Design a protein around this ligand. Sequence first.
Ligand SMILES: *[B]([O])([O])[C]([C][C][C][C][N])[N]C(=O)[C]1[C][C][C]N1C(=O)[C]([C]C1=[C][C]=[C][C]=[C]1)[N]C([C])=O
Lengths: 26, 7, 249
Amino acid sequence: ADCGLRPLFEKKSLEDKTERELLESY
Amino acid sequence: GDFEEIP
Amino acid sequence: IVEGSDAEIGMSPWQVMLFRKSPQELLCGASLISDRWVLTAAHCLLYPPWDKNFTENDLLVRIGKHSRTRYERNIEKISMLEKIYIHPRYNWRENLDRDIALMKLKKPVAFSDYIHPVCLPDRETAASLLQAGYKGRVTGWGNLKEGQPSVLQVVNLPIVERPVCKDSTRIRITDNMFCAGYKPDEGKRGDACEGDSGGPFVMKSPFNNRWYQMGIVSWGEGCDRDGKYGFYTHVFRLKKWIQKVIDQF
Ligand SMILES: *[B]([O])([O])[C]([C][C][C][C][N])[N]C(=O)[C]1[C][C][C]N1C(=O)[C]([C]C1=[C][C]=[C][C]=[C]1)[N]C([C])=O
């Protein structure tokens, strides 16, 4: 529904410090 | 243990 | 988590702590999939070889946590279980095949900044993300070495080819599992460890930007040992059972 969309990150359009590491492996 | 009590 | 880093506040709003009352202590990790459903590893609740058999009356769930041992006063919610569901075919006898359990909370939890559900994978998501080389995220409050953190730990681990997984252990590997971690020649490391069990292995979809729980911390021979890998319950594979109990109860 609203799953996997983090309040403090995705919802505010803020990136955690290592998430780019993940999206780069894709 | 190393745990702070819970209500 | 060995060779991990402190999570940031709200990094894993789905991370749940399984905590026993007497004696009060960290049992395992877990994940919030809905307002009243928590997903964990069955070996957290039932493991006869170690005389482990937890009833609902024995457990407490702690959601929205950051500090391991602290009672995060206005942040965390503590839930009582209504009923536990162990996959009828969990194989505690040989290899922890089907190491998944659903816990029904006695009352739904209110979402917040620190408590938000993770998405369960669909066929196309799993198909896209569950690929060797692709990094996933494991979080937990378990041992730091094969030694306990103050704060939720995190580490990003690459999915490893099935052959390499098979070839690294004497344990009989099934389709309901996958392995993850760096290879000796990759120069990075990390892994889950005691207390990490039931914790989520999650990936972020590049299609819709959502976080999906691809796995559950199941097992591994030691923590962060070279040429060894971490094994995770494959969530999609057991999706229909999950779907089955949710829709049934
Ligand atoms: B969990 O915290 O309870 C723990 C987390 C994995 C840490 C490893 N990197 N999981 C376990 O302890 C599981 C459950 C019982 C045995 N087990 C192991 O990981 C065993 C190996 C094993 C695997 C499958 C079936 C039986 C045993 N590992 C060790 C060192 O004994």
